[PDB]
Amino acid sequence: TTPSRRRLMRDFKKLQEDPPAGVSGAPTEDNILTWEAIIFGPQETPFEDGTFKLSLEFTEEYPNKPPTVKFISKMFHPNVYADGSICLDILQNRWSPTYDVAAILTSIQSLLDEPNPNSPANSLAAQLYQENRREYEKRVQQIVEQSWLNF
């Protein structure tokens, strides 16, 4: 009945009434603080056809403090760490307690075809993205197919 859980319940209600395209997610049945979500690869991009599973972990400090979001499906992206951790400014220092699960997933969806070049978490990817966009798309297609083994 804590404030964090109450907000997360509202987050779910809003996400269900009007879910963004290619975006869905729900709290694990044993812990509302831990969710699971799915982001479909944006339409006309190299991530096209992707079915990416994500994990979202909230603390009791939510919504004041952002959750940590990691891709469960394998990933190849400039802003994604080896453990699947997503490096996204709104989850770090540009975080606003007004952002909800729908907004977070939507941003991560947009981040797919528009990598933040500030500080890559994945070097090989930031390199191929700028210096060999053909090899980059090859390895992304490899991740797209593997993402099907998840859902």
Q: How far, in Å, CA of 116 to CA of 89, rounded?
A: 9
Q: At a CB cut-off of 8 Å and minimum separation 6, what does 71 contact?
A: 52, 53, 54, 55, 80, 84, 86
At 85, list the tokens.
Answer: 């951790």
Q: How far apart are CA 31 and CA 28, in angstroms?
A: 5
Residue with tokens 């930031």: 126
CATH code for position 17:
3.10.110.10
Q: How many domains does the chain have?
A: 1
Are residues 58 and 51 in contact, defined by beta-carbon separation less than 8 angstroms?
no
Structural determination approach: X-ray
Catalytic residue among 87, 104, 112, 126: 87
CA distance 13 to 24: 12
CA–CA distance, 39 with 107 (Å, rounded to integer): 10
CB atoms within 10 A of CB 147: 24
Q: Quote the tokens at residue 7.
A: 């907000």
The 8-class DSSP code of residue 41 comes to P
Question: CA-CA distance, 56 to 6, in Å (whole number)?
Answer: 16
Give the residue among 78, 77, 75 at the shortest CA–CA distance from 119.
78
Query: What distance, in Å, lies between the first and last C-alpha atoms of the chain?
Result: 31
Active site residue 70: no
- Resolution of the structure in the document, Å: 2.5
Q: At what angle do helices 123-131 and 133-147 cross, to 10 degrees?
A: 130
For residue 133, the enclosing domain spans 1-151
CB neighbour burial string for 101-140, b if at least 16 within 10 angstroms, e if fewer:
bbbbbbbbbebbbebeeeebbbeebbebbeeeeeebbeeb
